[PDB]
């Protein structure tokens, strides 16, 4: 792979083949055990999902050693959660100190106190959604520096080694391994990190006066191809759809909560009330209400 | 040349000698 | 400040305007750029120069003085060389 800069300056059979590929990567495992015994850490950099491969390594080989699986594709994990997990469950040392590097110093002391109590550490997606900051990678490199702790990890993003400087890449004593499974990224993309019908479904739950207020904004939008707030207020007080200004502000706050209406303030202080839907579907919606 | 067919052909060249 | 009507300056602009005098000053030829930079930091720690609130040599700055204060410093100064006293007038 030797990219050209001119692109920047001008800017079935598959199941059996995948099973043979997975059986070869399953055959690699004793070599990984010897490589982890010599102090190197394993890094996988294939195309497809490597979740099942590292789960098979935890299941078939590390069935009795201490293991902390870490799901790096989790949107909401924190490095405090992982250090708290090690400090509380592996060592029974209680909660880790609030400074993460103090927690790594504590983990290094307590793991210096116990030889031949190895802690395997499997991190699917070391380039995770909350591990992409430099600080969490510094914590993971300081943890992988420990002789007791061994590390297996997955890599998926193309720009991952931009956050590993030579100090982290020396603490991460990686043995790179091309584990290119062709499996789809189901679990890695299942999480949160990666409409006229909904408008009808929320319009059905509204009361009659809320239907009248939204129909007034729909009629003004189709008539003008966002309405100022004062016209909606005078139209509602003429049609008796509201008691005072504050109930109308509560109804528009409910519409902002259910995203039927976008409120764009003007420089003059008037509030504009756009409906964020194209006018053909809005005309069909007005025809649906008749 | 595979090792098995080479070893077999060399043994044949020895036994034919 | 008098030319650009109180625009924010920089160490590079002020060092260039100083070196244009220093090349013909016949007493300031010997200074290194590092000595002028440490003199600029000495101006900055007295709060005669204040940052607009980027490298330390390129940070923008503001003079904290009226021109009349510098003009009275020009008269109150002891043993001022005549070349600097002539350069101050123009």
């Amino acid at each position: 792979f030797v990219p050209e800069s001119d692109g920047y300056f001008h800017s079935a059979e598959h199941e059996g083949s995948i099973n043979a590929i997975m059986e070869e990567y399953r055959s690699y495992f004793p070599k990984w055990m010897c490589i982890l015994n010599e102090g190197f850490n394993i890094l996988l950099y294939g195309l497809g999902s490597k979740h099942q491969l590292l789960q098979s390594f935890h299941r078939e080989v590390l069935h009795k050693q201490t293991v902390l699986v870490v799901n790096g594709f989790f949107p909401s994990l924190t490095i405090k959660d992982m250090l708290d997990s090690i400090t509380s469950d592996i060592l029974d040392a209680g909660i880790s100190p609030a400074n993460p590097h103090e927690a790594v110093d504590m983990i290094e002391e307590e793991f210096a106190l116990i030889p031949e109590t190895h802690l395997f550490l499997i991190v699917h997606n070391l380039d995770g959604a909350m591990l992409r900051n430099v600080k969490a990678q510094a914590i993971l490199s300081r943890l992988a520096r420990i002789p007791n702790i061994h590390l297996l990890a997955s890599i998926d993003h193309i720009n991952t080694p931009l956050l590993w400087d030579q100090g982290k890449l020396c603490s991460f004593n990686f043995s790179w391994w091309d584990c290119t499974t062709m499996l789809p990224y189901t679990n890695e993309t299942a999480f949160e990190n990666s409409a006229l019908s909904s408008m009808r479904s929320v319009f059905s739950s509204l009361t009659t006066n809320s239907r009248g207020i939204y129909m007034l904004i729909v009629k003004y939008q189709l008539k003008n191809k966002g309405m100022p707030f004062r016209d909606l207020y005078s139209s509602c007080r003429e049609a008796f759809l509201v008691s005072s200004d504050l109930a109308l502000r509560a109804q528009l706050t409910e519409f902002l909560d259910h995203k039927l209406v976008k409120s764009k303030r003007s420089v003059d202080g008037s509030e504009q009330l756009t409906i964020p839907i194209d006018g053909a579907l809005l005309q069909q919606f007005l025809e649906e209400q008749e | 040349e595979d090792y098995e067919i080479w070893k077999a052909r060399m043994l044949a060249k020895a036994q034919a000698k | 400040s008098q030319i650009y009507d109180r625009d924010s300056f920089n160490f590079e602009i002020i060092y260039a305007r100083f070196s244009k005098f220093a090349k013909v000053s016949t007493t300031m030829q010997a200074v290194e750029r590092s000595i002028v930079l440490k003199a600029f930091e000495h101006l900055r720690i007295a709060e005669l120069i204040m940052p607009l609130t980027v490298q330390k040599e390129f940070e923008m700055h503001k003079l904290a003085l009226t021109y009349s204060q510098i003009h009275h410093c020009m008269q109150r100064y002891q043993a001022l060389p005549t070349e600097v006293a002539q350069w101050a007038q123009s």
Binding site: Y8, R132, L162 | - | -
Partner: protein
């Protein structure tokens, strides 16, 4: 007197050209105030344009980018939180004479591209 690896020298002079040559002149120099901001892909494009050897994009090269950042030879004028998303902006923070010394040791004449 700053001894450097070879590809770190090419990365550093490419970052100097990225911060000194402005965004518009790369199309005329490479298809064949202050220092300017530059994105990391602009740095890799200028590095591949001046390299004339084409090494692959290994882990070690982007590791050289990050460890040049850690030595305050480069800087993070913005971005920081999203180095990997391409929104990061770097800024080279060295003088011209060190670049000419690196181009003497390397043999790459920097002044042709300025």
């Amino acid at each position: 007197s700053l001894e450097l690896p070879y590809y770190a020298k090419f990365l550093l002079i490419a970052a100097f050209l990225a911060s000194h040559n402005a965004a518009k002149q790369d199309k005329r120099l490479f298809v064949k105030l202050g220092p300017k901001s530059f994105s990391i892909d602009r740095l890799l494009a200028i590095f591949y344009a001046i390299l004339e050897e084409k090494v692959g994009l290994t882990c070690n090269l982007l590791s050289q980018i990050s460890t040049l950042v850690h030595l305050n030879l480069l800087s993070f004028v913005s971005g920081e939180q999203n180095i990997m998303e391409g929104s990061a902006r770097l800024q080279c923070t060295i003088g011209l004479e060190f670049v000419l010394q690196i181009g003497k040791v390397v043999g790459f004449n920097v002044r042709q591209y300025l």
